[PDB]
Amino acid sequence: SLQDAEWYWGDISREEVNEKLRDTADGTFLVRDASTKMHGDYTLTLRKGGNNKLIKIFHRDGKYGFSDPLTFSSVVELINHYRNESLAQYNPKLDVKLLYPVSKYQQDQVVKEDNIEAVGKKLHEYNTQFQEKSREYDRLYEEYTRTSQEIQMKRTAIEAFNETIKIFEEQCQTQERYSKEYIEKFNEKEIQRIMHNYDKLKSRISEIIDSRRRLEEDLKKQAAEYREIDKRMNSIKPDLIQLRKTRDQYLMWLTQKGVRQKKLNEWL
């Protein structure tokens, strides 16, 4: 019972706890070995949304306890009770139970293929797919970032386009003032070549608008694909999670029957 206990992983240090408690929710729990015996004995760890709560199990006169409620004749004794009830009665701000015993030895899936070698081959399949997925994700994450900056360059260009157009409109305004202030004289020679200036000026304000428009039409084109990348990013993201989470369980059911810590890196 005690070594099995289902939720007892013993010699896992502080890290592989939070790393096995990563991304579950509410009331999830599991028991640890304490780090020093110049410290305590076992550690109950809770989960309270992203925050990991650490509770000390003290073992003295055959008694196991958090504090003085030492009556609780076993490690395995003390836990059960609190899977049924709240910890709030021990200390106020602890209004959660141990309802989620998430520690299920991961024989739930993993295709139950007793092979070990076959289970390891799966491990490789999933781990490649993962990496394939992580790169697609990554490629996309970057396309997104470029496209964000390329949109905002297009926005300021649009602005600079408008600004330019103002300066030019202003310009053929400015002139009309001084231009049709001279048209009064008899000399229509000079007038002709004042019309030329005026007529360069307007077909230019035409060209410029033709160019801003052309760019607004590409801002939408971009804003489109930008939407697309986001769509596809959010579509990879959930797949990258369950692929990733099944790769944690295959790696567990392996190091459950026979460690071989070093052998694994061939399937990764």
Partner: protein, 1044 residues
């Protein structure tokens, strides 16, 4: 030592002897047509050369105008100034008519002729600030936000103050700002250094110049290592002026008159010795010792130095109760509710995703209530919930730094975040947030697979086209304020008396008090644990209950503060008085209090009060990166920390130089731009003459960015030979010669660069096309230090991981050295200056192990000879120079082995390991750093990144067969075991340094367990004896034997 390329002199013995230059393109065509819009309404089009100065263009324009109709309606050319729209969409008046066409950043090739209003010309040379920042000042003038406009107005205090301190004993004070003394942390010279000195003395070489002078004059001296610059000057003048015609009295008199007309300068760079410190404390002096060099100083007239300092002359910028007493937060009789309205812009496949909801929580670093989501209502197809969410926390128990963290999610357990955003529940004026809010969200980062992200920045994402989520905060028919300090203090006095009268006891039994329970020096124990070793609830209750005893152990504070229930104003109010006069603590420890786990203003205020007391300009520029980064976790624009950093920056131009670049570096990162531009604006407005220098460095780097951009797109599938001509052609153009020629190196401003040596300039072989550049050192004693200065400019790699790692290395070296154990790291210079753009220090006389092996190794290629590195080294160091070359190599290699293992950098092989001629070994190109490439598997790797292959083992045991078993190797193993152990006693410092980097968008550092590698690698959960074995075990397994 960036001084000498870390070149050791092994004999020397003291005891003997796309939108770049115009919108669309990178490089304007060498000939270009320009529209000149005349104030008479005409447009004349000039054919201009790309590099023509506005002075030339104007002159040509007003000669051409005479040919178009309406001439006499024009004034004199002198009466006018050009304006145009620039690439940031802003009309810019071009005052400096010596600027070149290709350098105005136009957009469209056109200029408008106007007569200048805004008549304060002076004030409008204010584009200078905007140029240095990379965004026009007028962008700020336009920002509606009251916080922003309050920061601009309120920060000026700091500016005026600093400007005061400088102009105090002017000019000496000014000199001291521009050229602060480069100085070690302690005067106590480490035992290994003292000992290159023969019972405490250095030979130094004081140089001097009279007429013209193409003659300079040595005066070799031999003085105690600890004798000040003034003494040293006296001694040179004394030497220089003794004569058979001057008696002894007369000599003493002449020395008095002269002693203080002079100051000491390092020959070859811009480093001076302007204050009383033991000579040994100046970093140059100490470098020279280590390197086996004779210091070369120069005697400089104080006047000719004061001469090169100009008046900084600061100008205050143009931009020069409440709701009738308001209502206190602690009066609102209700729980908290927030109404979630709708999202707009969610991008999702109705096919791939079932449903979406808003996940929310209230947070202070980690969270103060039951977390809670709204129902999965009208999912994907137009997202509308119209729910009040109900949090169980009373409004009076909200702490000053309370945040809301929300995220939009997908959904047997599909739980997946789409986008995320955080809001401060109070604003910069202490106002509880009420009414309606539009929050633009952030995209789920690389790493984070969590559901909520409370580390992320507080505020709306400034991309318009993002998931915008509308929100509604309650209304209590008044604006609500966070209580006064004096109000909180009474509440604490009350709480205290009130405890003193209970009798029952629960968990947080706040009850012996009167004595200590003595074995209850669990407290001194908890105190020593690193910050990453989670605290358990029993301990949390415990530290709380003995809060008053904790004042006895000041450095227990980080842990106390995490034992507080921040959802309890009773508890928080008490903590406030406790902090109010906690003993200040060493800065290596205060700095944790400025990471993302400690957002309270009172706590951070404390931290800064620690730094204000203890942090020295030496140790501040060592941690300047972490300090800048931490600004991201400050809640508001105006905070005590920015005031502190800013006031140092404007008070010490070496700190300010790097403050500028670190900020400027991250200006693209939209999560920090607005904050950092604002900060940069203050700085630039008040730094004084240095602005002109920055503007030059900035002009250079834009030229380098724009040039490499052309190479990287559009000049590949070209041979190096073709690329190189293009390169050289371009640097020959006048605009480039001008931009890139006389300026300070951003890697170390003490290094002038001027006069490019194009023949020594190349594109290195890398696919990112880095530029190897080489500049004449223009100093009058170049010779005496280094004639040529070479740095690498690289465009394409994110330099800041390297940057961090080198900084870690530097800090490791110091810890080892200053504890008297001599391991020689070579943390070369690296500076990120942009988005994936940077400068790497070049190190002369270093070769990849791979090259060493390629140069020596016989005719027909078959197997590589293991002895050749050793051969190569023997050849470079014949004699008894040898024994010390093998010692340097043994030592550096030992250092770069422990640091490597601890940090878990990328695998070391023959071309990321480098050797120097003096036999110094150093790593380059680190890859990732905390075994980041275990984002896949990893699971208890703890890899040995630096494996000593035979090659290295040979060298270490001078040339033995079966090196595993020699004395030298025992010697080595001892340095290793000693260094590992040394760095382990400083683990807190290292963890804290990584913590403060969670900000920076560094994929390798996203969460505190990205950082947890370090605990494994340094065996923090074990006793040190066990750790030694762990370390040996680790080394034993990678080498297959040797370590027992």
């Amino acid at each position: 030592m960036s001084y000498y390329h870390h070149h050791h002199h092994h004999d020397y013995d003291i005891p003997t002897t796309s939108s770049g230059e115009l919108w669309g393109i990178h490089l304007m065509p060498p000939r270009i047509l320009v529209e000149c819009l005349l104030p008479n309404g005409m447009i004349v089009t000039l054919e201009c050369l790309r590099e023509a100065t506005l002075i030339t263009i104007k002159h040509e324009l007003f000669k051409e105008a005479r040919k178009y109709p309406l001439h006499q309606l024009l004034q004199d050319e002198s009466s006018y100034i050009f304006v145009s729209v620039t690439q940031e969409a802003e009309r810019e008046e071009f005052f400096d008519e010596t600027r070149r066409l290709c350098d105005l950043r136009l957009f469209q090739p056109f200029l408008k002729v106007i007569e200048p209003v805004g008549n304060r010309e002076e004030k409008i040379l204010n584009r200078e600030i905007g140029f240095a920042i990379g965004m026009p000042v007028c962008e700020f003038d336009m920002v509606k936000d009251p916080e922003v406009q309050d920061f601009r107005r309120n920060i000026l205090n700091v500016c005026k103050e600093a400007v005061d301190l400088r102009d105090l004993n002017s000019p000496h004070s000014r000199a001291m700002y521009v050229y602060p003394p480069n100085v070690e942390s302690s005067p106590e010279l480490p035992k290994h250094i003292y000992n290159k000195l023969d019972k405490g003395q250095i030979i130094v070489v004081i140089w001097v110049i009279v007429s013209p002078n193409n003659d300079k004059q040595k005066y070799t001296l031999k003085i105690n290592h600890d004798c000040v610059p003034e003494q040293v000057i006296a001694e040179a003048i004394r030497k220089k002026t003794r004569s058979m015609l001057l008696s002894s009295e007369q000599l003493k008199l002449c020395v008095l008159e002269y002693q203080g007309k002079y100051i000491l300068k390092v020959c070859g760079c811009d480093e001076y010795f302007l204050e009383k410190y033991p000579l040994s404390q100046y970093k140059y002096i100490r470098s020279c010792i280590m390197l086996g060099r004779m210091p070369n100083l120069m005697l400089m007239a104080k006047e000719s130095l004061y001469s090169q300092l100009p008046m900084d002359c600061f100008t205050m910028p143009s931009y020069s109760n409440g709701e009738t007493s308001t209502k206190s937060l602690w009066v609102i009789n209700s729980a908290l509710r927030i109404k979630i309205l709708c999202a707009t812009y969610v991008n999702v496949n109705i096919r791939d995703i079932d449903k979406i909801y808003v996940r929310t929580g209230i947070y202070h670093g980690g969270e103060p209530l039951c977390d809670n989501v709204n129902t999965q209502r009208v999912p994907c197809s137009n997202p509308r919930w119209n729910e009040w969410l109900n949090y169980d926390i009373y409004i009076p128990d909200l702490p000053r730094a309370a945040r809301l963290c929300l995220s939009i999610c997908s959904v047997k357990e599909e739980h997946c975040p789409l986008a995320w955003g955080n809001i401060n529940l109070f604003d910069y004026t202490d106002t509880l947030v009420s009414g309606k809010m539009a929050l633009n969200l952030w995209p789920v980062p690389h790493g984070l697979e969590d559901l909520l992200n409370p580390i992320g920045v507080t505020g709306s994402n400034p991309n318009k086209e993002t998931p915008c989520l509308e929100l509604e905060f309650d209304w209590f028919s008044s604006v609500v304020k966070f209580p006064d300090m004096s109000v909180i203090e009474e509440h604490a006095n009350w709480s205290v008396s009130r405890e003193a009268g209970f009798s029952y006891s629960h968990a947080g039994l706040s009850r012996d008090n009167e004595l200590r329970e003595n074995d209850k020096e669990q407290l001194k124990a908890i105190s020593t644990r690193d910050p990453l070793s989670e605290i358990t609830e029993q301990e949390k209750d415990f530290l709380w209950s003995h809060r008053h005893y904790c004042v006895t152990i000041p450095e227990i504070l980080p842990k106390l503060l995490l034992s507080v229930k921040w959802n309890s104003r009773d508890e928080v109010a008490q903590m406030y008085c406790l902090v109010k006069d906690w003993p200040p603590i060493k800065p290596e420890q205060a700095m944790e209090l400025l990471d993302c786990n400690y957002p309270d203003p009172m706590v951070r205020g404390f931290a800064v009060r620690c730094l204000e007391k203890y942090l020295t300009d030496d140790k501040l520029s060592q941690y300047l990166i972490q300090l800048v980064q931490v600004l991201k976790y400050e809640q508001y624009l105006d905070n005590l920390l920015v005031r502190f950093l800013l006031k140092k920056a404007l008070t010490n131009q070496r700190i300010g130089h790097f403050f500028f670049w670190h900020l400027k570096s991250e200006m693209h990162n939209k999560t920090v731009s607005q904050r950092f531009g604002l900060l940069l604006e203050s700085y630039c407005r008040a730094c004084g003459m240095y602005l002109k220098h920055l503007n030059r460095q900035v002009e250079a780097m834009e030229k380098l960015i724009n040039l490499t951009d052309i190479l990287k797109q559009e000049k590949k599938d070209e041979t190096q030979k073709v690329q190189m001509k293009f390169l050289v052609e371009q640097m020959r153009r006048p605009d480039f010669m001008d931009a890139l020629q006389g300026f300070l190196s951003p890697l170390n401003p003490a290094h002038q660069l001027g006069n490019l040596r194009l023949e020594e300039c190349r594109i290195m072989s890398s696919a990112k096309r880095p530029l190897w550049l080489n500049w004449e050192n223009p100093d009058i004693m170049s010779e005496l230090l280094f004639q040529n200065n070479e740095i690498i400019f690289k465009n394409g790699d994110d330099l800041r991981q390297d940057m961090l790692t080198l900084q870690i290395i530097r800090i490791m070296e110091n810890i080892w050295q200053n504890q008297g154990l001599d391991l020689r790291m070579l943390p070369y210079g690296c500076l990120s200056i942009g988005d994936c753009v940077g400068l790497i220090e070049v190190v002369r006389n270093s070769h990849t192990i791979m090259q060493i092996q390629c140069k020596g190794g016989l005719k027909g290629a078959l197997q590589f000879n293991s002895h050749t590195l050793h051969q190569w080294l023997k050849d470079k160091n014949k004699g008894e120079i040898y024994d010390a070359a093998i010692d340097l190599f043994t030592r550096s290699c030992a250092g770069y082995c422990v640091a490597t293992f601890i940090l878990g950098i990328g695998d070391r092989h023959n071309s990321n390991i480098m050797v120097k001629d003096d036999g110094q070994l150093f790593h380059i190109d680190f890859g990732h750093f905390l075994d980041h490439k275990k984002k896949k598997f990893g699971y208890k790797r703890e890899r040995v990144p630096f494996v000593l292959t035979q090659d290295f083992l040979i060298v270490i045991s001078k040339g033995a067969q079966e090196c595993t078993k020699t004395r030298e190797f025992e010697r080595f193993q001892e340095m290793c075991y000693k260094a590992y152990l040394a760095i382990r006693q400083h683990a807190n410092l290292f963890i804290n340094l990584f913590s403060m980097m969670l900000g920076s968008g560094m994929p390798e550092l996203q969460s505190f367990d990205d950082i947890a590698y370090i605990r494994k690698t340094l065996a923090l959960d074990k006793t040190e004896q066990e750790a030694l074995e762990y370390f040996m075990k680790q080394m034993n397994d990678a080498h297959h034997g040797g370590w027992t």
